[PDB]
């Protein structure tokens, strides 16, 4: 049950004026492709606040990567889902090395040591967002991404033909994608969706990985890409949501760099 939106004043959408004339803003299966300019965040924020949405943000910070947590969480506090309930889950082998970062109200952090758990996510959050920790939020990352299942366009392949995508190409692998298949090349550093859809993804990925290991063949990205080929995501994030400015600059087609590699 979705309650009524309030009165809001904003510019009328123009049916005969395309949103962007430089990029694809919807997939062939009618999933939006989220670029700056495609969304009114005020409408979306209302929609998700009225549902009292809670978002889990999972990071794995092992060994030397704990060094990146401080900048990651600090910048998340400024840019990630500001205004909504956020639950950080930091998986680490060094719980004591996790920095004390000050969190805004309605936001919490759990440290989970690694050397009825998945069940925990189902009762605690509505969506899960899984990302790499050696990263920095530089601009808005908000509820526009939220959907049952989403992937993010790999920043070095978003203009490439499918032949050039570095999918798994060996037929013996469960991640195998032939040269004549593939919609996009998704990167493993930013994906998510509902808790249910994310658990299905990681479960299917874990089983495919074990089958490959059993067949003497050896990763994350290739399996994610196979999964999202066969289970089309309900939104697709533009490379705004995972960029490397040192490696790729700031091209015109990116009006914002939201989430980036660290110099
Ligand atoms: Hg638009
Ligand atoms: Hg995750
Ligand atoms: Hg992840
Ligand atoms: Hg996966």
- DSSP for 17-31, written as a single string: S-S-SSS--B-TTS-
Residues with CB under 5 A from ligand 1 (ion): 19, 37
Q: What is the distance in A from the centroid of ligand 2 to the CA of 147?
A: 15
Burial readout 79-106 (b: 16 or more C-beta within 10 A, e: otherwise): bbbeebbbbbbbbbebeeebeebeeeee
Nearest residue to 245 via CA among 165, 158, 141, 155: 155
Instruction: Judge contact between 255 and 36, C-beta under 8 A.
Output: yes
For residue 51, the enclosing domain spans 1-263
CATH number of the domain at 56, please.
Answer: 3.90.550.10
- The resolution in Å comes to 2.0
Q: What is the distance in A from the centroid of ligand 2 to the CA of 130?
A: 4
Overall domain count for the chain: 1
Instruction: Judge contact between 72 and 40, C-beta under 8 A.
Output: no
Q: What is the distance in A from the centroid of ligand 4 to the CA of 189?
A: 10
Q: What is the distance in A from the centroid of ligand 2 to the CA of 9?
A: 37
Instruction: Judge contact between 89 and 54, C-beta under 8 A.
Output: no
DSSP summary character for residue 68: G
Q: Which phi and psi angles does 127 have, rounded to 5°?
A: -130, 150
């Amino acid at each position: 049950f979705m309650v009524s939106l309030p009165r809001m004043v904003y510019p009328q959408p123009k049916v005969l004026t395309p949103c962007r004339k430089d990029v694809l803003v919807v997939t062939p299966w009618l999933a939006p492709i989220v670029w700056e300019g495609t969304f009114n965040i005020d409408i979306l924020n209302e929609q998700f606040r009225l549902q009292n949405t809670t978002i889990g943000l999972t990071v794995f910070a092992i060994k030397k990567y704990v060094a990146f947590l401080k900048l990651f969480l600090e910048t998340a506090e400024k840019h990630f889902m500001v205004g909504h309930r956020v639950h950080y889950y930091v998986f680490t082998d060094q719980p004591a090395a996790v920095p004390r970062v000050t969190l805004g109200t309605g936001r919490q952090l759990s440290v989970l040591e690694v050397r009825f758990c998945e069940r925990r996510f189902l009762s605690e959050v509505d969506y899960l967002v899984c990302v790499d920790v050696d990263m920095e939020f530089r601009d808005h990352v908000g509820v526009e991404i939220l959907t049952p299942l989403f992937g993010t366009l790999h920043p070095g392949f978003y203009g490439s033909s499918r032949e050039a995508f570095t999918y798994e190409r060996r037929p013996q692998s469960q991640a195998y994608i032939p040269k004549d298949e593939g919609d996009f090349y998704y990167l493993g550093g930013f994906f998510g969706g509902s808790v249910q859809e994310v658990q299905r993804l990681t479960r299917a990925c874990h089983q495919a990985m074990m089958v490959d290991q059993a067949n003497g063949i050896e990763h994350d990205a290739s399996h994610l890409n196979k999964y999202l080929l066969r289970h089309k995501p309900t939104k697709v994030l533009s490379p705004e949501y995972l960029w490397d400015q040192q490696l790729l600059g700031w091209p015109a087609v990116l009006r914002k760099l939201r989430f980036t590699a660290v110099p």
